């Protein structure tokens, strides 16, 4: 029976391979060749947020595109005012080993997670005036890598148990458990419509999950090593991935196949963070060579360096309005990049 | 140029900044001892000796407050979170001395001791763990006392040209772990055979950490 099932699985893999090959009319490079290049996108360190005493593994902008929250191994979850370099709050975490942080779409909650296997929800808009733990979400048996806020009541967390989950803040129980990965899930990216979310894992595979349903829709492959980071295209019909192979790749939702690859001969360092722009044309990526080489989302040509960090850039996120690109790195300093006129 | 509460907002940040510096200085006054135990070898006995995932154990000796993280509980990919511990003062490793003859139950192919050596090999010459020392611990040596006499060491290391004497065989065990260290110019391991009832486990860790403190002080003064 297993022999037949194993054969059947190989046949199914070949069946989807033929469908992807048949639908592959042409590469994105060939069709989008008449378009002009973006040009030399030079950036300047407008702000130099310097409050963290240790390595920075996560950051996330707010919905207002002004407040950002950074998580560091010091044990702090500082919430900064990027406009004036003011620290609105300095949340002391229970466990110093935090590798993910999130900002609620409403802005009243921030979540942290890491090697403690617990996603801790913090309440900002409180009467007492001091941030407090709203609820600690437990149930994951492995290290938690990335958590994104669906809304003020639902949060999607991806851990190292090769499974993603959906939680309810009021109750604290896993409403849905997304399983199917064969490797540790390193990052997830909530879609703008908040109806689907994709997450890359250590098995060099990215799967399309459905929060409403609870099972995987499409599975994407092509990478050779662990997918460290993932981001979703603004239109909601594509998503980019970053892996240790130094070849960031763009995948199409409808086409169900890889479109382009972003690799350079000089670059061999792994990718720790990937983020698009407002129009989905400026594919920011945080490499391990202390740089953040800007990649064109339609030409696969480098358009920037962003080399201003002493250590690896662990996190990087564009704002909702696209007016700033924070590039928080292991050097304990965040950097609010911006394109000068 | 600054409003009434805009000036107060900056004042609030200064209080926040002072708390971070005050708490950051306290964190720099602490020793972080990572504990990479093997499979049913360590991180269960020594953890009690110095008084779901990360289980930080705190014990104070000689007015020094050590933080000991036992990450052995986690079963995920080690390479994807080992960078979180980059910068620890020392890495307390543990290898059982009774695993020389016992084979791995799960693998049923290679003995448990080689798996620890393979695990030790990756940790010793890891890219991030080049400066941090390794306080190697050979625990449960009391069982190894009579195990070596009844069971020869040729099961694990047939190249061992020695008799059933514990001291002759134990020295080879020490010599079989130092070679795995590649960066011999920036990291020295303090191997120490220890029993179960001995109370000197705490003292040796403090002595090995003190050597790391001296080396760190040397880098600051411009010397080493």
């Amino acid at each position: 029976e297993l022999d037949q099932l194993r054969q059947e699985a190989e046949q199914l893999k070949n069946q989807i391979r033929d469908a992807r090959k048949a639908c592959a009319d042409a590469t994105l490079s060939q069709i989008t060749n008449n378009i002009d290049p973006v040009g030399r996108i030079q950036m300047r360190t407008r702000r130099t947020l310097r409050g963290h005493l240790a390595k920075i593994y996560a950051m996330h902008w707010g919905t207002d595109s002004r407040l950002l929250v950074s998580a560091s191994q010091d044990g702090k979850l500082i919430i900064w005012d990027s406009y004036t370099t003011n620290k609105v709050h300095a949340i002391p975490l229970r466990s110093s080993w935090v590798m993910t942080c999130a900002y609620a779409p409403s802005g009243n909650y921030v979540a942290c997670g890491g090697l403690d296997n617990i996603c801790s929800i913090y309440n900002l808009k409180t009467r007492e005036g001091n941030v407090r733990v709203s609820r600690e979400l437990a149930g994951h048996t492995g290290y938690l890598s990335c958590c994104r806020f669906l809304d003020d009541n639902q949060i999607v967390t991806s851990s190292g148990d090769t499974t993603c989950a959906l939680w309810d803040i009021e109750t604290g129980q896993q409403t849905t458990t997304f399983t199917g990965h064969t490797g540790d899930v390193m990052s997830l990216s909530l879609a703008p419509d908040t109806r689907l979310f994709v997450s890359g894992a250590c098995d060099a595979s990215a799967k399309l999950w459905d929060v409403r349903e609870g099972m995987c829709r499409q599975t994407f492959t092509g990478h050779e090593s662990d997918i460290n980071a993932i981001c979703f295209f603004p239109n909601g019909n594509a998503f980019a991935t970053g892996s240790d192979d130094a070849t960031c790749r763009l995948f199409d939702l409808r086409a169900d196949q890889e479109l382009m690859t972003y690799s350079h001969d000089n670059i061999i360092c792994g990718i720790t963070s990937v983020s698009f722009s407002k129009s989905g044309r400026l594919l920011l990526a945080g490499y391990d060579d202390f740089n953040c080489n800007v990649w064109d989302a339609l030409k696969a040509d480098r358009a920037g360096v962003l080399a201003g960090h002493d250590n690896r850039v662990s996190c990087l996120g564009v704002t909702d309005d696209g007016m700033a690109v924070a590039t928080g790195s292991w050097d304990s300093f965040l950097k609010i990049w911006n394109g000068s006129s | 140029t600054l409003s009434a509460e805009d000036k107060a907002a900056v004042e609030r940040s200064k209080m926040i900044d002072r708390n971070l510096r005050e708490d950051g200085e306290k964190a720099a006054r602490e020793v972080k001892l990572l504990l990479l135990g093997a499979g049913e070898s360590g991180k269960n006995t020594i953890v009690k000796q110095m008084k779901t995932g990360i289980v930080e154990t705190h014990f104070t000796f000689k007015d020094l407050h050590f933080k000991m993280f036992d990450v052995g509980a986690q079963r995920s990919e080690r390479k994807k979170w080992i960078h979180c511990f980059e910068g620890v003062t020392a890495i307390i490793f543990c290898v059982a001395l009774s695993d020389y003859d016992l084979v791995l139950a799960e693998d049923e192919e290679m003995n448990r001791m080689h798996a620890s050596m393979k695990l030790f090999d990756s940790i010793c010459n890891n890219k991030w763990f080049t400066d941090t020392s390794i306080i190697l611990f050979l625990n449960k040596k009391d069982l190894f006392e009579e195990k070596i006499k009844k069971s020869p060491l040729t099961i694990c290391y047939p190249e061992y040209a020695g008799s059933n004497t514990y001291e002759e065989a134990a020295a080879y065990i020490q010599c079989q772990f130092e070679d795995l260290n590649k960066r011999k110019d920036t990291k020295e391991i303090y191997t120490h055979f220890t029993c179960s009832t001995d109370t000197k486990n705490v003292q040796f860790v403090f002595d090995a950490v003190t050597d790391v403190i001296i080396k760190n002080n040397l880098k600051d003064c411009g010397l080493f």
Partner: single-chain antibody, 230 residues
């Protein structure tokens, strides 16, 4: 969030008394404190202020030097030392808290109140009393000597409602943002000089005196006060 105040009572002219405000139910250390007086049949007036950590201390011009303010965060208490009390100093003193960060609501909660029976921006209200009826819409307006719109883009207005027998309660902070717990029927807008408070259908709790307070320059001059007759 309770602010019990003590130290009030009859005093002789020129005497000295200490006013103690007790803070419980919130992080007193991280909250700035304000002292606001309320003379009988008169509008509110800012008295003194102490910052978080006792960093910056300010006093009103009429009370500068003559009064001193201190806090004791281990005991979660506020102290206002009164020296050389005159006949003008009589008022209904209130203990007011305020936190200062981006998106905060300063002057959110007010204390119970204690009575002591012994270049500035001029905020003027058009009328001191407007009759109202349930189901109607009223627009309380105020005036400012100088523009309150800082370059940051904020119109520094704080609306307060003083229910009879009750301490003033914040309604709208920064002239656009509604405070926590305030019904949505309250609304306000305007420019740095044009001021209004577009109130929806009035209810039983809408009675009292409405105050407009400026915050661009720290003297913190309150408005004349408009009463809403039932």
């Amino acid at each position: 969030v309770q602010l019990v105040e003590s130290g009030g009572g009859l005093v002789q002219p020129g005497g000295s008394r200490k006013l103690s405000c007790s803070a419980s139910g919130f992080a007193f250390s991280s909250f700035g404190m304000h002292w606001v007086r309320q003379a009988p049949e008169k509008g509110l007036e800012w008295v003194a202020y102490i910052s978080s950590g006792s960093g910056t201390i300010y006093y009103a011009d009429t009370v500068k030097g003559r009064f001193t303010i201190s806090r004791d965060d281990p005991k979660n208490t506020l102290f206002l030392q009164m020296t050389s009390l005159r006949s003008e100093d009589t008022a209904m003193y209130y203990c007011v808290r305020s936190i200062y960060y981006y998106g905060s609501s300063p002057f959110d909660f007010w204390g119970q109140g204690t009575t002591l029976t012994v270049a500035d921006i001029v905020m003027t209200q058009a009328t001191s009393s407007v009759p109202v009826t349930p189901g109607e819409s009223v627009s309380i307006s105020c005036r400012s000597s100088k523009s309150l719109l800082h370059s940051n883009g904020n119109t520094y207005l704080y609306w307060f409602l003083q229910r009879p027998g009750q301490s003033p309660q914040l309604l709208i902070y920064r002239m656009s943002n509604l405070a926590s717990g305030v019904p949505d029927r309250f609304s306000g807008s305007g420019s740095g000089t044009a001021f209004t408070l577009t109130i929806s259908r009035l209810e039983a709790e809408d009675v009292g005196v409405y105050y407009c307070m400026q915050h661009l320059e720290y003297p913190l001059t309150f408005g004349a006060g408009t009463k809403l007759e039932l």
